[PDB]
């Protein structure tokens with residue numbers, strides 16, 4: 001749009017391209033998202049616009065602010081606050097030491113807080129990944145693309161057409177459940193969390209069935225004792241191999257005992273069992289929470 005001096009592409013990003021931009025009236029430096037053609041053309045659906053218009057109100061310190069919504073020319077453009085780094089890049093930069101525990105803790109504490117806020121208002125993320133977790137020089141972290149991550153509907157090929165990433169999807173969704181809940185985002189965070197401690201992805205699936213089976217190898221195949229309802233689930237197959245539950249000390253060393261109870265609660269199979277974001281805030285794990293300031297440079 002014509003009020004925006006484009007500064008740089010900052011990454012092709014699911015629903016469409018996101019530039020760093022400057023606005024001339026304000027003088028602010030922002031992130032400008034161009035929302036991919038259909039949904040963009042013909043015209044946005046009256047519903048895409050209305051749902052998006054709700055986001056604008058849903059403001060929390062650990063959600064990236066939706067600054068504006070230029071609906072114009074039958075194009076759709078979303079103007080977010082800018083952040084200099086994502087958490088993936090930081091993990092990548094931290095690879096040889098690891099991220100320090102106190103920082104991990106702080107990150108985790110804050111992410112839980114915004115997910116609780118959103119969740120209260122019945123809004124879910126649906127696609128949490130380290131690349132939409134967004135940090136600043138002041139020891140902070142926010143969720144990006146919250147509630148987009150539905151209003152248009154997730155791309156299978158992404159973008160252009162490498163895949164999304166199934167690494168963080170909750171098993172409900174993989175199994176063909178349709179009316180899933182806030183627990184999904186819970187499932188993702190815990191996958192994020194293990195990745196911070198171990199320096200490897202918990203479950204790197206490269207297909208839906210490899211994603212599924214990767215989970216069952218580590219966590220057991222689910223039965224009706226641990227997950228009541230399971231076998232009636234749409235894509236559930238009686239022919240699924242049964243694997244045994246691995247022990248958590250093996251899978252994410254060296255998390256402490258409180259860390260591992262945390263983790264396991266966010267990894268519960270049954271959705272109505274998984275810990276919520278508001279109980280998790282209460283866990284002994286966050287006893288010693290502080291607020292370190294990280295090591296960037298530029």
Ligand SMILES: CCc1nn(-c2c(Cl)cc(Cl)cc2Cl)c2nc(Cc3ccc(O)c(O)c3)[nH]c(=O)c12
Pocket residue numbers: 008009010011012013014018031032064080081082083084085086131132133134144145
């Ligand atoms: C909220 C708007 C925004 N969206 N994305 C982004 C996300 Cl959240 C997910 C995905 Cl898959 C791709 C992108 Cl592109 C962003 N990435 C960065 C980090 C960044 C910062 C400076 C850069 O030059 C750069 O290449 C990347 N900074 C941002 O402000 C931002």
